[PDB]
């Protein structure tokens, strides 16, 4: 049963890469997963379910959407959009926003209102993420490469890690490497991302930094 992300949740999964990015001292166990769930649905459901089954993966897909679920937070009852995943449970994706929330109200304390680079909303952030996905990919290329992994991202994602203090460079990798271990049927879905997105002309900073990392994985 592997959760096939449509283009619908693309935004929301966006957001929680942004929670994690925002979050201080993140916890980015599940990070790797939420990263290539993000690559599923900028791919979408159709071209994941036809990648899998190409690489010859048998594949029971499992429909995501967006559902409201109401939990009590400090007595007050708080509604959360959560997405319907097999491999991410709902206390999980909560716990995300919870910590992220406790993270926004400390900026909020020490800046004022977050300008939009800030924010856990930013439209880059799943972007961000998948940089050190890209950086993973080319050291698991290569033939351990964790050292240079954490070396190169705190030099090319230097803007990046100043605008989110989630931006742990050697979290986030161990999470990919975990991922790409864990599941290989992952490492396609995201050479086919990375080879569909890179063919993508301008766009943002962040969107062009990892059609770079990407090329690099080749020379």
Same mark, same amino acid.
């Given at each position: 049963s592997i959760d096939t992300p449509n283009?619908?949740?693309?935004?929301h999964i966006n957001k929680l890469c942004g929670m994690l990015l925002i979050t201080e001292d993140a916890n980015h166990?599940?990070?790797?997963?939420?990263?290539?769930?993000? &690559?599923? *649905?900028? #791919?979408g459901r159709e071209d994941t379910i036809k990648i899998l089954r190409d690489a010859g993966y048998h594949v029971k897909a499992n429909g995501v959407d967006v559902t409201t679920h109401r939990q009590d937070i400090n007595g007050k009852e708080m509604k959360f959009e959560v997405l319907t995943l097999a491999s991410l449970t709902?206390?999980?994706q909560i716990n995300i926003e919870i910590e992220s929330r406790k993270s926004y109200k400390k900026m909020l304390k020490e800046m004022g209102e977050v300008a939009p680079e800030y924010r856990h909303d930013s439209p880059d952030c799943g972007m961000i993420i998948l940089c050190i996905a890209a950086l993973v990919i080319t050291k698991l290329a &290569?033939? *351990?490469g #964790?050292?240079?992994v954490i070396r190169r991202a705190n030099n090319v994602l230097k803007n990046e890690m100043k605008r989110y203090k989630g931006?742990?460079?050697?979290d986030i990798?161990?999470?990919?490497?975990?991922?790409?271990?864990?599941?290989?049927?992952?490492i396609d879905v995201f050479v086919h991302f990375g080879i569909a997105q890179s063919s993508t002309r301008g766009g943002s900073r962040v969107e062009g930094i990892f059609a770079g990392l990407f090329m690099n994985a080749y020379g």
């Amino acid at each position: 049963s592997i959760d096939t992300p449509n283009y619908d949740v693309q935004k929301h999964i966006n957001k929680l890469c942004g929670m994690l990015l925002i979050t201080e001292d993140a916890n980015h166990k599940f990070t790797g997963l939420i990263g290539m769930l993000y &690559a599923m *649905s900028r #791919l979408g459901r159709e071209d994941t379910i036809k990648i899998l089954r190409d690489a010859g993966y048998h594949v029971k897909a499992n429909g995501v959407d967006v559902t409201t679920h109401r939990q009590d937070i400090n007595g007050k009852e708080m509604k959360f959009e959560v997405l319907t995943l097999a491999s991410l449970t709902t206390e999980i994706q909560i716990n995300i926003e919870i910590e992220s929330r406790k993270s926004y109200k400390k900026m909020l304390k020490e800046m004022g209102e977050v300008a939009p680079e800030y924010r856990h909303d930013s439209p880059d952030c799943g972007m961000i993420i998948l940089c050190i996905a890209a950086l993973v990919i080319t050291k698991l290329a &290569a033939g *351990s490469g #964790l050292t240079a992994v954490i070396r190169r991202a705190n030099n090319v994602l230097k803007n990046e890690m100043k605008r989110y203090k989630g931006l742990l460079p050697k979290d986030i990798a161990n999470s990919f490497y975990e991922v790409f271990e864990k599941h290989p049927h992952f490492i396609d879905v995201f050479v086919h991302f990375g080879i569909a997105q890179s063919s993508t002309r301008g766009g943002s900073r962040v969107e062009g930094i990892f059609a770079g990392l990407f090329m690099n994985a080749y020379g």
